[PDB]
């Protein structure tokens, strides 16, 4: 599933919602701990409706346990990410994936 370790806390009172669009800065690494995507390189925070399914299991589900402010290491095993497809091109068959999210505004 997904474990959310934290590594600031958030206000621990406001919570996303779903039909909200969390507002994140996040980065992503496979097992090895290789960052191999990073909303912060880009200086622009990420976008994602919670409930419209448009981000994988584990996020939805995690970043949903998360209070505005918050920044956690969320740890998703592969069945709540890309399960044995993998996402071609960047996460391979069976992978863990382990995103360093700080959840920064509800829209
Ligand atoms: C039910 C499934 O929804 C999805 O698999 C998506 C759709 C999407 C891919 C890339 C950029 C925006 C949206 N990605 C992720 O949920 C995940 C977490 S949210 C951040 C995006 N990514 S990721 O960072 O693991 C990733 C980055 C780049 C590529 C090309 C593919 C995945």
Redesign the pocket.
């Given at each position: 599933g997904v474990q959310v370790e934290t590594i600031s806390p958030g206000d621990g009172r406001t919570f996303p919602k779903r039909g909200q669009t969390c507002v994140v800065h996040?980065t992503?690494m496979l097992e090895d701990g290789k960052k191999?995507?990073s909303?912060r390189d880009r200086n622009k925070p990420?976008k994602?409706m919670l409930g419209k399914?448009?981000?994988?299991?584990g996020?939805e589900e995690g970043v949903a346990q998360m209070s505005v402010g918050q920044r956690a290491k969320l740890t998703i095993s592969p069945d709540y990410?890309?399960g044995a497809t993998g996402?071609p091109?960047?996460?391979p068959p069976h992978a863990t994936?382990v995103?360093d999210v700080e959840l920064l505004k509800l829209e």
């Open positions: 996040y992503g191999f995507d909303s990420f994602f399914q448009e981000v994988i299991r996020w990410a890309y996402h091109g960047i996460i994936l995103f």
